[PDB]
Amino acid sequence: LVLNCIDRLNVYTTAAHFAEYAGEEAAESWKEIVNLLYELLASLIRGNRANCALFSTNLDWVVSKLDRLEASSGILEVLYCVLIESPEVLNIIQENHIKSIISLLDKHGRNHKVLDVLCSLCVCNGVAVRSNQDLITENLLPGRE
Amino acid sequence: MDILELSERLDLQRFHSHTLRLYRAVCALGNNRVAHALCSHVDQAQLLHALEDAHLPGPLRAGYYDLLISIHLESACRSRRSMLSEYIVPLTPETRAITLFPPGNARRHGLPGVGVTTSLRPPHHFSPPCFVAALPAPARLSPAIPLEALRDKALRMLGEAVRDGGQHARDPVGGSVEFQFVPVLKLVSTLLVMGIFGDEDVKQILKMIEPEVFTEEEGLLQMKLPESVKLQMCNLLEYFCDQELQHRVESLAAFAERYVDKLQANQRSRYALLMRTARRTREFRSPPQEQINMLLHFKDEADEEDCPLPEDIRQDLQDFHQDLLAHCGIQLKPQSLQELVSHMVVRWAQEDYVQSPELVRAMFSLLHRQYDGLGELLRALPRAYTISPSSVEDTMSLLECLGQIRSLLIVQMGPQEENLMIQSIGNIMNNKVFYQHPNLMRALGMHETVMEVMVNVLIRFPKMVTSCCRFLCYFCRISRQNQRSMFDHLSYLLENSGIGLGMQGSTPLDVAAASVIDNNELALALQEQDLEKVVSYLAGCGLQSCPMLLAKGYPDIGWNPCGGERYLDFLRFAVFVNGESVEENANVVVRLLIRKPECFGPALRGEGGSGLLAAIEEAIRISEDPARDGPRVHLGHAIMSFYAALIDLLGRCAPEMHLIQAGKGEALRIRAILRSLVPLDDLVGIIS
Amino acid sequence: GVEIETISPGDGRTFPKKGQTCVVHYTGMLQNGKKFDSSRDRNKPFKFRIGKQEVIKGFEEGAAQMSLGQRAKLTCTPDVAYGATGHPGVIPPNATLIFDVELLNLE
Amino acid sequence: MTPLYNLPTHRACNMFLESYKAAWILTEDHSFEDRMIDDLSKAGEEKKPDPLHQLVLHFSRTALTEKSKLDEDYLYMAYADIMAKSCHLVSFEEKEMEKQRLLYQQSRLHTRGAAEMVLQMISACKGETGAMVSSTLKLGISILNGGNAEVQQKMLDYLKDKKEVGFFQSIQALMQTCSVLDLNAFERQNKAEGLGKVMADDEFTQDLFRFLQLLCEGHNNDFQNYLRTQTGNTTTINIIICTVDYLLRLQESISDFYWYYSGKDVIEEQGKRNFSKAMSVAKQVFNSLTEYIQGP
Amino acid sequence: THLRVGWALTEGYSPYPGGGEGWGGNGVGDDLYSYGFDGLHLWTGHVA
């Protein structure tokens, strides 16, 4: 139900666009509502392995929203909670996902939480993913920028 | 800007520290290729400068120390640590020269960790980094760094830190005593485990730890330090306790070699004079283990009558037992490691309430080890084994391959690791020692590791699965003890030998079948639960079409003759041993089969269904018609093979003739049931 | 190809011949100025023998034209320096490389 | 039997090592448990806990850690054995001297939370038989021998305040997993020995019922009623009925074993041994029921 | 080894030890107030 609410509220690019259909009095709380929705989703998914494993099917849903200017921190926290718990998501993570996260670093600046996410992508429960380590090395180090 | 400005620019200090954490993450767990790539970014000169930089912030100093350990030492240290639990002692003259106490009932204790050790340990392999060589596969080796210079630098830095700590400077290096000592102690512990330090270096380390006890200034053991430093001191003392245990094992093996030689010479002389009555000749007509049990059964003075050993030899053995107890400190200012460790641990525990559970566990494990030394040796003897000097090169090669396999237990499976595993198995099977010394192989426990690898993969890697299955089949076929060892995991294999056998090669069901062949004891120890599980699998196989065949476009039939045949031959080996029928299992299997009649297939089904001859004729017509056969498996042949296997199994379940003559009611009942199931006329029709 | 810019004159009489082992010090940098490799940091001269495809083509083409004691700049084009694939994690695709090479000894 | 001196040297050395370890090392007796406990129980020069107390708190912490299954730890097994072996070790005067020394040795343990540690470890095992539960039961018997009233009170108070059902669920599962005789297994063994087990966990069953008997020793009516019913708990488990159920299964097995040997005049050694151990278990069960119902 | 010779302007040429433009080690020709010559290159504006 929360996911459906987020998807339906995400179809508007900005508050003014939402105001063109719901009015200004309803638009002044659009950003607050979406931030609360992501905060509740994070509280609902923190620490539950079964719930984090539920995201092994729709990971692109979370990744494609990383570039949104609103609730950027909440969505990043949701991704961090999923990745720190579910090894299946690491087995489903692909190159386009890693390139998207690096572009997140490139566009939103030097944030240590993105670095912690990349660190978490490598090893989970004492087992390392060679493919992830190689893709990160190939797509992050040689640029030297 | 100068990197020292990060002491005030905290945002960049944190970002760079997490960057170093990411470097360790990417090169973690044996990724030597990434370690080489990282060598282009963080070079040796920078690392060495960072080690001696006294103004560096604590987090950066710790990060660079851990980066150096991760890049250069982690893989070698881990492989050596894995190899440290075994004691393969060659019978060389250096081993012969080993004694419990130095020549200079009980004498003064020697220095721990100094002396001659003959236990086999594979050498480390390193490759020089280079980024201009033509780009070429064999696994890459770890980068090489000057170890003698690194160990000298570490010793000098630790000594300087010790002196500064004695001075109690108000500006400790790194901002805190923890940041001053923990990285250095981690580096020293890693180098100690890798065994780089020599005798003089170990003596210097022992002098800094305790200059008064380890004499042939003030120590670390009496200075107030935090829990992390206490933990590193516990790791060091654990290392030296392990070295003492290894020394005891090597001395015991040397004495065993000398005493066995004396025993053989004495027995040869006694037999020589005896050749010139059952009591006199019983010794030489008994198995050698019983012979040596009788020869060594003279410990008590109330049974020293039957022992023919001379009193001088008995005295020699009693003298060695006495000096073994003395070396273990069993009574017949601290001056020994055991008393030093006990005093330090008790003082620490009664001075403050320890909050670190890891530290608490470490100190109580060490205390238990000091108090119980004989039991530790007793539990370590099963992993000790003496080998001939001519098999050293093959044993070292086998240890290298086993180390590679063990290094493959902490990495996600891939095509390259699969190829490495396959070639390692081939190299192991190409070694004569693997067949000459089966007891040593069981003590090494390769089959447990292979089974654990197999369950971790569980089909994505059929070549790997069939390679593991062939290895275990060979292992069972070497000796009966291996077969008995594998029989304990029969249920473990069966629960994973479900649908998805693979249409490739040997399967866990095949290894399980190979683990019970020609063994009456294991056949009689075969549990009924395993047989009900197998019959339940066969029943499931007998009701649905084969999904792989359906995915390959074969015509649909409501059963799987191939899978049913595979379970049938397993029951054939389970019920027929050494040319005779085991009636307990035959009766159980037959009763289960009749309790589940749908296992017999569309034929013999009842309430509609033709006999065996009609089924065979239909199969023949299917074979003669290509459209009904294929879309390589031929359905007509599979069906005939299935019914042939079923009839073979029922025939082998038949009661014995001596039982029929004895008139056993159960035997007559079983034969009557089998006769009712299989008419004679159908048999003659098929034979015709 | 390879361009050679001399920085310090050599002997100018003794050139590398077939089969000889050359021992050199080098520093390898990218065209953007970023340094990626240097043997001087390891404090160990790099040794290789001529004509056995042991190094990238441009490097040995440059070193073949250098005399004993000479210091020179070698420029290597992408078509010979690792080509289109580059070096995973160290050198990006289509990188033109710059080498500061000094020929210390032969055999 | 080729003579020993014709064997290769390394193989003979390996056989020597196995024989030496089997005949000389294990047979040695070394008693250090009392000295170790004495050393750990002394402070020196709110009272911070002494080292033994911190050890017990550490094991209670790992017992209370929320995890699906408790991992095996040799360190805990070793210290549990040491603690159990350090607590037990004719005229009126020395009989009383022995009782007082036993009470002091038990006080050194039960005054540092050992009873609660035992209950927590038993609840943590969740009814899975093994060395962990066997060591815990042995320690509980060691600290409960002589039906110490103070220990009984501490256990009852802890159970009533926690109101946890895991303890009795584990006890019920263990009682349901206790094994009895098996004629099919006996026949299989007879054939195996003819080519040229039965009640393996009898010691575990005996110590389980000895522990239950010691919980009610001394006519503890409060503990007898608590065993019959747990008022404060959400669910109630009747241990008495489970005991009768096991007694019935044992009786039926004994009856079948008697009919099997009734026809034959001679009874072999293995049959006599299995009869003896079955009778010993039945004796322990009868004693436990007697302690359940006395008081009355 | 670094070695350059040339002219510098009083105003603007204040090279401090340590860090600076690009990689540290600023000398003559590393800014627009100085004009150096090292034997092989003409240095100005941190460009050789």
mmCIF file of C-alpha atoms in Angstrom, chain A residues 138 142, chain B residues 33 36-37 130-136 140, chain C residues 81-94:
data_model
loop_
_atom_site.group_PDB
_atom_site.id
_atom_site.type_symbol
_atom_site.label_atom_id
_atom_site.label_comp_id
_atom_site.label_asym_id
_atom_site.label_seq_id
_atom_site.Cartn_x
_atom_site.Cartn_y
_atom_site.Cartn_z
ATOM 1 C CA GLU A 138 36.784 -0.786 -13.492
ATOM 2 C CA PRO A 142 40.872 4.640 -13.429
ATOM 3 C CA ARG B 33 44.196 -8.581 -9.305
ATOM 4 C CA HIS B 36 47.832 -5.080 -8.037
ATOM 5 C CA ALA B 37 45.591 -2.356 -9.418
ATOM 6 C CA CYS B 130 54.534 -4.041 -13.063
ATOM 7 C CA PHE B 131 52.220 -2.041 -15.326
ATOM 8 C CA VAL B 132 54.261 -2.040 -18.556
ATOM 9 C CA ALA B 133 54.389 -5.784 -19.278
ATOM 10 C CA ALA B 134 52.479 -7.061 -22.290
ATOM 11 C CA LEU B 135 48.962 -8.038 -21.289
ATOM 12 C CA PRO B 136 48.376 -11.801 -21.676
ATOM 13 C CA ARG B 140 47.765 -13.904 -9.921
ATOM 14 C CA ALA C 81 49.876 1.125 -25.802
ATOM 15 C CA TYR C 82 47.346 -1.506 -24.649
ATOM 16 C CA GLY C 83 45.043 -0.693 -27.567
ATOM 17 C CA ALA C 84 41.316 -0.230 -27.078
ATOM 18 C CA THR C 85 40.906 -2.467 -24.016
ATOM 19 C CA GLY C 86 43.517 -0.664 -21.922
ATOM 20 C CA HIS C 87 44.426 -2.006 -18.505
ATOM 21 C CA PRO C 88 41.572 -2.867 -16.103
ATOM 22 C CA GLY C 89 41.543 -0.417 -13.207
ATOM 23 C CA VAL C 90 44.780 1.390 -14.068
ATOM 24 C CA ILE C 91 44.698 2.723 -17.638
ATOM 25 C CA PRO C 92 41.480 3.831 -19.382
ATOM 26 C CA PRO C 93 40.770 2.988 -23.035
ATOM 27 C CA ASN C 94 42.629 4.847 -25.794
#
